[PDB]
Amino acid sequence: RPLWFPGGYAPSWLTGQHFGDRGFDPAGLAADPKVFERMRVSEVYHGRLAMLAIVGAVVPDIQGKGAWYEAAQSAGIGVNEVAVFTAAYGIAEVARGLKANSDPTSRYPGFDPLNLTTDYTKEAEIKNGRLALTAMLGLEVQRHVTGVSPLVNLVEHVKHPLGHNIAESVMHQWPVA
C-alpha cells in the first residue's frame, strides 16, 4: 500500500478502496462512514473548483491585466456582481445538491463527450485536484507574506534561488498585503 508517510501505518477506516486513499487521516475526520461519502464529494468539488481557480489566477496575470488579487477591482466586479453570480450559480448548485451523497453521479455526472472515463482518469482528477488545492493555499499565503504577484514570486525564485525563497521572505514583518 502506497501511503502518504513512510512506516506502513494506515487508519482502519481508510482501507484502500476509494480513489486517493493514501492512509492519510491523522485527525480521524473520516472515521464515521456517512461523513466519509459527503467528504468524498466535497474533495472532488473543492478540487475541480481550485483547478479552475489556479488556471484563472495565472492566465490574466500572464496577459498583463493585473494579478489575481487585483483583478476584480481592475475590471469592476463589486459585491453586487458576486451576488448576481451567486444567485445564478445557485440553480445548478441546488440541482446538484438534490441528489444523495451515495449516488456515483454526485461526483461523476456523466458529461463525457470524448469517453475518457477510466480509473486512471479518476485518480488523475483527484491528484491534480489536491495539487491545485495546495496551490491555491500557496497563492493566498504568498500573497500576504511576499506582497507581490505569484508569477513575480516564481520568476524571482528561478533567477535568484537563494535570494528569494521562503526563508528570506519570512524574516521580515510579513503581513504586508
Contacts with ligand CLA by CB under 6 A lie at: 38, 41-42, 45-46, 49, 52-53, 55-56, 59-60, 63, 65-66, 71-72, 74-75, 77, 86, 89-90, 93-94, 96-97
Q: Helix crossing, 33-62 with 119-146: angle to 10°?
A: 60
- Does residue 64 bind other proteins (CB under 8 A)? no
Contacted by 20, from other proteins, ligand CLA, none: CB < 5 to 8 Å by type: none
152-171 residues near other proteins, rule: CB under 8 A = none
Q: Are 151 and 140 in contact (CB under 8 A)?
A: no
Helix (H, G, I), strand (E, B) or coil at 71: coil
Check residue 118 and report its DSSP letter.
S
68-97 residues near other proteins, rule: CB under 8 A = 75
Could you tell me where the DSSP H helices lie in the chain? 33-62, 79-96, 119-146, 150-159, 166-169
Residue found by looking up cell 461526483 in the block:
107
Contacted by 11, from other proteins, ligand CLA, none: CB < 5 to 8 Å by type: none
Contacted by 63, from ligand CLA, other proteins, none: CB < 5 to 8 Å by type: ligand CLA
98-127 residues near other proteins, rule: CB under 8 A = 105, 109-111
Contacted by 38, from ligand CLA, other proteins, none: CB < 5 to 8 Å by type: ligand CLA
Number of residues that bind other proteins (CB under 8 A): 5
Q: Are 177 and 147 in contact (CB under 8 A)?
A: yes
Query: Is the Cα dihedral 16, 115, 130, 162 positive or negative?
Result: positive
Report the C-alpha gap between 58 and 123 in whole angstroms: 24
- In the complex, the residues that contact other proteins under the rule CB under 8 A are 75, 105, 109-111
